[PDB]
Structure formats: C-alpha cells, structure tokens
Design a protein around this ligand. Structure first.
Ligand code: CL
Ligand code: CL
Ligand code: CL
Ligand code: CL
Ligand code: CL
Ligand code: NA
Length: 129
C-alpha cells in the first residue's frame, strides 16, 4: 500500500532495521521516501532491462528474479513479485542482504543523493516508536 512516514518507521523498527549495519532508522525511512514515495507497489524500468521493485526499489539485475532481466542474478533468492507485497518482510530481508554486502547503503542512489549528508533522524521525529 502507501505508508505514512511514522507508520513505516515503526514497521521498519519492528522488522529490525534500526541500526542494522550501523544505519539508524531515519536512513531507511528517508531511503524509502526517495526511492518509492513510501509505495510498496512502485516499479521502475531501467535502460539495462532490469526493474526496481517495491518500497526500497530493489533491483532485478542482482537481487531478485523477475524472469525478464537477461543475464541477471538473484542474490536474495526471491522472486521480485515478492517485493511488491504490502507486507515489507521480504523487502527488509533483502535490504539486510544488500546493506551487508559491503557497500553500505550506497546501493540506494536516491539515499546517497538525497538522504546522506542530511539530518536523517528528522525522518523519525515525532513518531511513536
Ligand atoms: Cl525487468
Ligand atoms: Cl517476479
Ligand atoms: Cl531473469
Ligand atoms: Cl524473506
Ligand atoms: Cl535516525
Ligand atoms: Na535477477
């Protein structure tokens, strides 16, 4: 569905993202805002034939299988369709893989461009967590 800011912060916290690999919860909330506008069903097609799926716009060249990304991997071991659920469990679990893969949150270029270097704790301000 389309989360509200504080709603998503609480859900991400329940699913273990607050400080996962050293990134505080506002980083994840800011990344979801700028990757998908909090929308679990967002998709975006890329010039390379891959597509970004779901709330954290996880990409089919590396991380999920969509059957239409030629030459791609599936390092989260999941169909990309699983990442378009209104329940964030699969997206969070795959994001945990991605952020642990040695490049931090730089995997999310909307995060790198629009969140990193800003006061990301503001994204959880006033939320009841
Ligand atoms: Cl695709
Ligand atoms: Cl799929
Ligand atoms: Cl494929
Ligand atoms: Cl999962
Ligand atoms: Cl934070
Ligand atoms: Na793939």
């Amino acid at each position: 569905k389309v989360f509200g800011r504080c709603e998503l912060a609480a859900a991400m916290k329940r699913h273990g993202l607050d400080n996962y690999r050293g990134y505080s919860l506002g980083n994840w909330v800011c990344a979801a805002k700028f990757e998908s506008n909090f929308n679990t069903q967002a998709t975006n097609r890329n010039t390379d034939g891959s597509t970004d799926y779901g709330i954290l716009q996880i990409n089919s060249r590396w991380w999920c299988n969509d059957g239409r990304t030629p030459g791609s991997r599936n390092l989260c071991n999941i169909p990309c369709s699983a990442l378009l659920s209104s329940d964030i469990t699969a997206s969070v679990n795959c994001a945990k893989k991605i952020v642990s893969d040695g490049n931090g949150m730089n995997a999310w270029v909307a995060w790198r461009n629009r969140c990193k270097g800003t006061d990301v704790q503001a994204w959880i301000r006033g939320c009841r967590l």
